[model samples]
Target chain A: KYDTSELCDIYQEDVNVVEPLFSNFGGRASFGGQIITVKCFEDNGLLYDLLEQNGRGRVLVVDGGGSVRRALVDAELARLAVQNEWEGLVIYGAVRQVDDLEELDIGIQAMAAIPVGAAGEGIGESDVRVNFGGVTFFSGDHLYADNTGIILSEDPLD
Target chain B: KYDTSELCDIYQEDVNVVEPLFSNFGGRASFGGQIITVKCFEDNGLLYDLLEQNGRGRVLVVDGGGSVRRALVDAELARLAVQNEWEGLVIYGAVRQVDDLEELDIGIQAMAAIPVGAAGEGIGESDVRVNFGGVTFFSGDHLYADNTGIILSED
Candidate 1:
């Protein structure tokens, strides 16, 4: 329930703010947790496979290179994330099934949305360091996001 | 009450989409109406002066050169706008008194918010065409905005 603006005031220079290039497409407008980054492009398998693992309230930060060409996350994957206890998702790409995604208890922030989606290609690497939105995201970095904005810190700011 | 995406689907090329660069800091997340353009930079006089007039459900688009230094619109000016019947405001500069601004039933989209403010100096032109975020805003043009995005259409 903590706002990003307040977090900045408390943490100050300890935070790395993500650029305001994303819009909320999930049910929860605010969410944050340990970042698990995936670098994929127009692929959904890498993401889906990751969601199959135990999220344990962790967040998936997919770096799709800001591509809005195809949806990387869909209703099915979102449900899987929820069941696995994933905190939320910050996709640098696009997402589909917005109507269904909005009903789930998960946070989703993406560049935009697309009507079409790509089948599992299973391409790309995970647990890697990726940079976008003027912030370099490293796996395990604590992320705090809300209506005010998105931010990242080395450890949990809680 | 309409979504910008739906408006795009309906209006097509007749609409110009505004970039997703602004954050909703007011009560209403979406709003649209006739745009009244103002070309001002770090000055609040022109904006305050305009809100004193009858708005008649129109939206004011202030071109603040995208400066986030001084707060261009504050709570007092926003409340005055409400009294004058202004539908909302799209400020390219900064704003202050966010906690108070969020209470009013007005749509406000701005680059960011600041703590300081600028007093009246009457240092900008009104009813002029201004461009930013890859869209040109002209006075009298209709604007449609929502959580999805913002769009403009010439009269």
Candidate 2:
């Protein structure tokens, strides 16, 4: 696992940098994998369906409109992501079960954590382009994240 | 070394709660002491002056306007606070030298960490009431903080 800082230093032109607005709540600090995008608003039904499938070491990036009112990811989905071999998860919104999340081996990054859960109406789209944090994320785009920040690219740098 | 959550549960009416907006960058997680408030806006001169005094295990609560653009506390001031026997510091602004901060014995709670240092114009007041995050902090009040959150109390 290479550092995002080094990636930015060498491939600054090739990568799209994300603002420093995330905190690492996952057990692992450094994680990088191909992106799988999810665009939702206070819903986690699509998130559940995606995590149930084989992750193949990909990173799930959810755009929840940066809502702190409800959490987009929780302990169950995180456990499933681990079981299915996900490399990590980056949530643009909030997450709950922070104490449980710290125990998991996968990397988890999010805006913050809230106690409340999402609406769960099965709303939202998957595998589509989503924008936030001054950067746009596309499905299959490579993402590298660590204590420094997140970096995005069309091709894997490592 | 008491938990804020437990403190909140017991002293519900007596305590003024602060939202969880800070991350523990210091070695110690739980710290409580008499509050010494400083109201500054991106200036650390008063902060430096306060840390230079005899702390007597007191905690410095700084209202830095919640600015992430500049750092109000650095390794030098944090080291000075330790040398002077201060218990901890809680800043509404940001701090820098995170790696060095982790090695200290003091408790540090701040909004975030930034690389930019603050201007040293000696601007801001001390020992005054400052409000933010739906709570008012006054000098000489008791403050207790841990990984869960921070709590303020009068009398």
Candidate 3:
């Protein structure tokens, strides 16, 4: 398997390469498994519930509609992901609890971090293919990230 | 004075701690003194000018209306702040030039880091109190930040 930085460089030359949002945090970790996608809006109850159920070493992709107005992840939920041993969390929205989240060993990528968190309405669709930032992420597809960029492939990039 | 982590823990426990919106450049060395606040809509020309004038070991608190659509500070202004010896900058908006900003010995707190920058229309208010994330920040108030949550004290 190729390292994350090498993979990111390949994607950068080939695709638009939306500059990795979390360059300062380091590269995204590559995980293998059937992709589980989530489409949520303004609420994270369903996302939280799903993560609580099947986030053990599995990536949780949140399609937050690219809104920086409110945060989708808070201290409690981030701690939940860590406790459940999640591989990573990719958020199209903001995340709070930076101090707490940094302590966790899990990987996280989000558009921004908001001081205000989202309300848990338990509203969202799960296990659906999602697309944003010039990349399409399907369930069971492969997602790769690093300090360079985030890339998606149907098959693992060797 | 309380230890850094203990102080942050107290703030986090008492006040609602918002998600962190700072670039992962580790953290600032230290920042102290009265925080002069400013609120600008989309333009930061006035903010830049004010930073140029003040910020002599003093902190400048700018409320960019929490808009990540544009950046509040760039490479040039960051260099300026460093040259003028400003304490630090806490922006409620987005910021660019992370790689460059890291090199400079200054502290910056913002919502996000964007490669693309904001349009400069030269419009925004300076030295005004603004509210966000259920926290109120005012000019002349003491603001202290290290590797912990930002604290505001009215004294």
Candidate 4:
């Protein structure tokens, strides 16, 4: 377990990081592990299915195509994320279940909140490279995040 | 004392709402309070202790100059924020302690989460004009934020 303070020393310039826009309502603190990438649009079947599997010590990065029209993660899926022991979840799109999600003990990142839910079934790719927030995220890549910024490397920064 | 939903409705368009990224972790469901701005760089010692002193019933807006290198807040400070009853914290820079912060009961926003920490003894202008996210924040200006977006105005 790496102390989050140590990760703060590797900051850089002009990275175009987004402002912190979340509150952790989960029970545990500091979830870091391996990377698992997913790409889907307007649909969240892939995301739901992937998280439903066991995910201990792994972080799920979902490339929701920056879509706000529909959410990629809802309360039901978030519950699955908690149950599966996923370290954290970063969404490039929107999500629902603000009140419910706030009660779970998982790391979550998203563009915004919505009452609207996402479609269940759709064809999408998993473990593929996806880009957003001026950074490219790939499967099996290591991700370290705190309140400061999200850092990505083809390999672990440590 | 206004209903948080009303504030969300008032600033529906003027501000850009961040997607819901919260999980149930013992945080106050709705927190709206007066703004106490802290402009600092590299060092958050003053801000940290200040939060300990005055975070009750207030929101701390930290303008870290959009730097990702050093974090203005860490897990310890975030714990202090919750203990002091701060409504939320907005960092212009990055922050550490994502997993720990998630466990705390407070609203937190920043440029991103980094593994870095802030340098000590750096000068920070407390309660001044600081700009970022395409808006200027002044001292004593009421800042209302929820899942809707961030809205700033002087009373």
Judged by lDDT, which candidate is best? 2
**DockQ ranking of the models:** 3, 4, 2, 1
Better of 1 and 3 by DockQ: 3
Prediction 3 global C-alpha lDDT: 0.65
True contacts kept of each: 0.00, 0.00, 0.11, 0.11
* Residue A43, candidate 1: C-alpha displacement in angstroms: 11
lDDT for B11 (candidate 2) = 70
Candidate 1: which stretches are off by over 4 Å?
Answer: A1-25, A28-63, A67-90, A94-103, A111-158
Runs in model 2 with CA error above 4 Å?
B1-20, B25-155
User: In candidate 2 chain A, what residue range of length 10 has the lowest lDDT sum?
Assistant: A113-122
lDDT, candidate 4, A55-136, per-residue tens: 8878888888888656677667888998998888888887765556667878777777654456788658999988887778
Q: Tell me the spans in candidate 3 whose CA falls farther than 4 Å from its real position.
A: A1-33, A156-158, B1-34, B37-59, B62-88, B91-155
lDDT for A11 (candidate 3): 61
Model 3 Cα lDDT, one tens digit per residue, A1-158: 22566765676554334445542221224333335788887688977887787566477778887766566776678778777777777787766555566666667777765544566888888888777886677677766555445666665556
Chain A TM-scores of all predicted models = 0.97, 0.97, 0.81, 0.83
For candidate 3, the chain B TM-score comes to 0.82
- Complex DockQ per candidate: 0.05, 0.08, 0.15, 0.08
Predicted candidate 1 versus true structure: per-residue lDDT over A89-139, tens digit per residue: 999988765667789998888888653465587999999989999999989
Model 3: colliding residue pairs? A27-A146, A35-A140, A96-B19, A97-B19, A98-B20, B38-B127
Best by DockQ: 3
- The CAPRI-style docking tier of model 3 reads incorrect
